[PDB]
Amino acid sequence: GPSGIVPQLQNIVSTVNLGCKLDLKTIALRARNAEYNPKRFAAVIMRIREPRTTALIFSSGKMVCTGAKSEEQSRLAARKYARVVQKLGFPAKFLDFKIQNMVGSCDVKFPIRLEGLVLTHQQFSSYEPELFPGLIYRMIKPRIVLLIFVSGKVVLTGAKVRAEIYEAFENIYPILKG
Amino acid sequence: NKETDMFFLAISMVGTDFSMIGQLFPHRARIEIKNKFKREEKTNGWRIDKAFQEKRPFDFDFFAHLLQKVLAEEEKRK
Known part of the structure; x- marks a missing residue:
């Protein structure tokens, strides 16, 4: 069963469709937090402090946001960006919000001999300290x-909902323990 | 210290456009701009809010001239 350590999410990724054409130059010009360097890439980067997230605009009518601590918080950040875009004068909308990725991490408070983990589970666990100390699973x-990792901390990524990360942790805990 | 004060003045006049601030700084790269942001935000959340409110004129000639003068003065005195 659980040891009292609940995995904590550190990042979320989400996207939404603005539903209208936009001009990247106009956004970069009229917005304070907007960052635009067309010589490097054809997109605008947005930053806000509450939520603590980073997002991008694209002229084809697309928006992506990431850095939030929860999917609801990511949606709040995306809607704030949509409001900013709307008040900048574009007829944008909050259409087809989708959660794309969320990351989590946890710990077990005991060492994990990665040698044993590989030599019992080589079929889906890959271990290669030289380029990466941690074991990839x-x-x-x-x-x-x-x-x-050696200290027993684990990073989890690829989920769409916290239930997946929780059940993943529960699935791996008996493997980590023994 | 003066480097952080100039960085704060830049965030005042232009906002969090890290690319242009990196371009106008003599040497600082984008990753350094991000790292400075991450380190300062904790204790200077109020100051970055003040910057966002302080929509100071972002003149090219004046900013270049004061950059050069203050950089030279600091380098001399330090």
Whole structure:
């Protein structure tokens, strides 16, 4: 069962369609937090402090946001960006919001011998300290990928909802323990 | 200290356009701009809010001239 350590999400990724054509130069010109360098890439970057997120605009009518601590918070950040775009004069809308990715991390408070983890589970766990100290572990139920380290801390990524990260942690905990 | 004060003046006049601030700084790269932001935000959340409210004139000639003068003065005195 659980050890009292609940995995905590550190990032969310989400996108939404603005539903209208936009001009990147106009956004960069009229907005304070907007960043635009067409010589490098054809998109505008947006930053706000509450939520603590980073997002982008594209002329084809697309918006992406990331950096939030929860999917509801990511939606709030996206809607704030949509409001900013609307008040800048574009006829934007908040259409087809989708959560794309969310990351989590946890710990077990005991060492994990990665040698044992690889030599019992070589079929889906890949271990290669030289380029990456941690052990890389992919899984099917749910479609998640993990990073397991010597200290016992684990990073979880690829989920759409916190339930997936929780159940992934519960699935791996008996493997981590023994 | 003066580098942080200039960085704060830049965030006042132009906002969080890290690319243009990096371009106008003599040497600082984008990743350094981001790292400075991450380190300062914790203690200077109020100051960045003041910057966002302080929509100071972003003149090219005046900003270049004061950049050069203050950089030279600091380098001399330091």
